[PDB]
Amino acid sequence: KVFGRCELAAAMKRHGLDNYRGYSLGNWVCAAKFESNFNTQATNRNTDGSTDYGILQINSRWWCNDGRTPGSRNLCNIPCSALLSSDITASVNCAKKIVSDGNGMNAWVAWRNRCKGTDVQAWIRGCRL
């Protein structure tokens, strides 16, 4: 599913991401836009053989099992395919684990290079929340 900007903001807010660990909703919507262009089915292979899955491009090296990433961890205890669902619950719950890892949202390269330090509030502007 390809989410609308405000539709995704509403979904994330309902799942408790707004201000989660101090990150305002705008940060999550901005990260999703640049990581997957709001597409839940987005996948991207990395040089190390791992793959990123879903709306928030969660990596198979540490967070989910895709059966083809040797010596990897499944910290979120979920098949990576579950992160491609139209229902973002799995992605949100796993993201909460990741952001509490100690490095915050810096774990998402796109957020660090394209959202961090910007007016992220603009991403939820005009939305009925």
Q: State the number of CA atoms in the 13 A half-sphere of 65 facing the CB.
A: 8
- 35 is a catalytic site residue: yes
| Minimum CB–partner distance for residue 80 and Na ion (Å) | 7
Supply 94's token pair.
């796993």
| Minimum CB–partner distance for residue 100 and Cl ion (Å) | 9
104 binds, among Na ion, Cl ion, none (CB under 5 to 8 A by kind): Cl ion
- Residue 79 binds Cl ion (CB under 5 A): no
b/e for 17-27, b at 16 or more Cβ within 10 A?
bbebeebbbbb
98-to-34, 40, 124 alpha-carbon distances in Å: 18, 18, 23
Residue numbers in the known binding site for substrate are 101
Subset of residues 85 to 104 that bind Cl ion, contact rule: CB under 5 A: 104
Count residues contacting Cl ion (CB under 5 A)? 1
Strands (E), 1-129: 43-45, 51-53, 58-59
18, 48, 52, 87: the active-site residue: 52
- Residue with token string 């799942």: 15
Of the pair 12, 94, the CB lying nearest Na ion is at 94
Of the pair 42, 99, the CB lying nearest Cl ion is at 99
Q: Give me the residues that bind Cl ion (CB under 5 A), please.
A: 104
Active site residues: 35, 52
